């Protein structure tokens, strides 16, 4: 129990670069790292908000993989591999 803060900063320049590389990007402007952090936070907040809604609906305190899969499906994304 500690108030977490500023962890968006854990999404580092090298992590972001590795992601762009997998995405086939050959060169990266220095301004994309902060931009990327912003889009990632939006995506995560939305998915996490929905996953917890499923969690609380079921009156649980522990978010499960299936709660996330349902939440992603909500965003029109189908995730394979976590139905176990």
13 is a site residue for another protein (CB under 8 A): no
Residue 68 within binding range of another protein, rule CB under 8 A: yes
- Give 22 or 27: the residue with its C-beta nearer to Cl ion: 27
Contact status: 15 vs another protein (CB under 8 A): yes
What does 40 interact with, of Cl ion, another protein, none (CB < 5 to 8 A by kind)? another protein
**Spatial CA neighbour of 11 closest among 28, 46, 35, 45:** 35
CB of 38 to another protein, least distance (A): 9
**CA gap 24, 65 in Å, rounded:** 29
- Tokens matching residue 25: 């990007």
Asked if residue 50 lies in contact with residue 75, where contact means CB atoms within 8 angstroms, the answer is: yes
Q: How far is the CB of 4 from Cl ion (least distance, A)?
A: 8
CB 82 within 8 A of CB 68: yes
Residues contributing to the site for Cl ion (CB under 5 A): 12-13, 15, 27-28, 72, 77, 79, 83
């Amino acid at each position: 129990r500690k108030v977490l803060r500023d962890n968006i900063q854990g999404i580092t320049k090298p992590a972001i670069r590795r992601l762009a590389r997998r995405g086939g990007v050959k060169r990266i402007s220095g301004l994309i790292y902060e931009e990327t952090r912003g889009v990632l936070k939006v995506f995560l907040e939305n998915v996490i908000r929905d996953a917890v809604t499923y969690t609380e609906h079921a009156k649980r305190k522990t978010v499960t993989a299936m709660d996330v899969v349902y939440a992603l499906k909500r965003q029109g994304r189908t995730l394979y591999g976590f139905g176990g």
